[PDB]
């Protein structure tokens, strides 16, 4: 049931926006690691002398890392004279959340029809104001509220090139990398508590409940086309086995963003390429499932792949879930940081083709107790 | 004139310390531009509850990078019961640094006979202390002095691997990247004023001074066998062209170091990879000067390289200086991160043979006038 309930017209997800120490080095190594090009800067070469800021794109994905200069450059300036392109930066905002949570998602930015009007009614509706609708080159608007922890919801529109003051990068230096990555599929909090994590979020962007022991309870928001999908994770405690969820509360400093989910045009590409790259300063990926969970493959998705398909899935550690419409193929990065926080995961969903229905296949739920039971299975 | 007044035994340059927001990012990215091998760590996966640490090698040169987690894993620790491998690390001194200068170096460590008397000398004779004598495991003593700025002159000494505490590197993340980078050749300063740093400097090491309008006035300070060499490097003020030394100071918030210098066995190839790399995760070089600088280049060192060598060099960019003693091949990255600060030197030295003698060829101060020239003449 999906009662299109949006409070305001969203579109699709525009951008993330990790807040970093050295955005230089952090973009260097994501888009090596993950083939993703240099398409936009904004810096001390373009006039900013607030903050470094570098985007990557590959297909629809946008990846914007930003990172403090010192603030003896703008001293001098007041939020009406700024040099800033994004507005809503901080010096000392950047450097606290880094201090506490290390590299991770500061912004999950998402495309609207108008970025005041979702503002205002956000706020109507219960939002936690993070940075008012600002108006950019008479071209842009953008406003922020809290989504959890430190992580903000940022609302982007346009009246008609990612944002005023940014410049497109020198061809010599936009490598056109790509491994067959081309959108955001969904981006996963972790809370202390979910059922006030998602009373809040529901109450003030009208998204609704996307229809789905071991570590967590989940719930998923959603958009009225279901295209922003919002996860939200809570532990479950005293476990046996450390929940994953409160590992991450403890050493993010609480709540925040824990994955990325990146769809693949062609998910066997991908992890081939980013797997290649996994030593020579790409991304390492979580230890992979025991043969028994592929022998175990052909019985219950069989019909949707064949042998040989089933057994590229095993050389490249590819896990496979299926819902009741569709079927879902996903991996999952070793934390991206120093800290056992962030990850990301890659995606390709078969299915529910109308375009292709957001969410098809669920997010892998099925997977924590087939892993499992493989573990135990191939212990024999 | 070498007068051998070292007040203390030196050995040899031993590592250079990276302090970082994000240590995992930053080594992976030097790694791939550099070439470099993953070949220690000291983290959570070996107990330490209080940084980050991995170290980087290619030949002799060791590179590490450390960033804190946050004090809340470690507030229950003091440091009797410390579970950090470098006991001179502190959470709020990191922060300080990399909040004040961004990513750059903590640390310039020498290998010492006796790190605890080479710091008592060095406190007797001005030094100013950082880190008092600590022995690691009964087998490595540490101690630290400050060098300019925020950066401190390490001392390291053993009784007879990296450091107790540091786990060699598991073979599947250890890839035998290398791009023929060998050891560290020189490590520079800016700093306000030279005379008072040198006179500090030289003041408590004995280290002597190594024999010799465009932006700097330096000096080099070198051990007993030259092998440890710090050139200083000052601004000159009012010059038309803004000096590099200046912009430096304005962007890194004072003094700093500027430069690591890095001897590879065979510049050509190693040029070669960095470049291959670029665009792709890797390092930068600063703009290649124009064909009439090569075309000086045989009045100048033709009888060093021959026409093919010379040629090799204008492919890649590479500038030759040349002194009295011997002949200098040398190439510069952009910087190494966001701010215009901290960039990394190739170098490659002909001549000197006895093994090479150290500073053979110079450090390429001859190739201010001769890239002036060279642009002026090529402007026709
Ligand atoms: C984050 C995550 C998702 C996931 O995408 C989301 C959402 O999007 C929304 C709904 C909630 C949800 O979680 C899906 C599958 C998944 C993980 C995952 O984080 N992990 C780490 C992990 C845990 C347990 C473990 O032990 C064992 F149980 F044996 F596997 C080993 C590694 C491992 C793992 O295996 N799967 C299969
Ligand atoms: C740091 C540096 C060294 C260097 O290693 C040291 C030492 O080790 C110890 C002694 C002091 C010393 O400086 C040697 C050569 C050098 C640079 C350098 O930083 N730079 C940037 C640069 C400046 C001016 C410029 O304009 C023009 F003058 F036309 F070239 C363009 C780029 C450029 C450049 O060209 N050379 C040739
Ligand atoms: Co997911
Ligand atoms: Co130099």
Redo the contacts with the bound molecule.
Sequence with gaps: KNPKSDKFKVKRFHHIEFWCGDATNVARRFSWGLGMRFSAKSDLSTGNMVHASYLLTSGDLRFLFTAPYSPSLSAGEIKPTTTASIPSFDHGSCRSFFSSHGLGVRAVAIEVEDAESAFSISVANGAIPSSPPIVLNEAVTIAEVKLYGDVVLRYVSYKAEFLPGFERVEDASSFPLDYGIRRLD?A?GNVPELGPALTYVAGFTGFHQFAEE???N?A?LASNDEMVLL?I?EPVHGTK?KS?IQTYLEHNEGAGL??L?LMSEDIFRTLREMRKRSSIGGFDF?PSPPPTYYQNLKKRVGDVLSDDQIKECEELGI?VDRDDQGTLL?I?TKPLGDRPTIFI?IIQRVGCMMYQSGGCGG???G??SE??KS?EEYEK
């Design positions: 969904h996963v071991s570590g967590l989940s998923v996860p994770n086995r994953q824990q994955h989910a979580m896990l996903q999952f995961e997010f892998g739920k997977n924590f892993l499992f573990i």
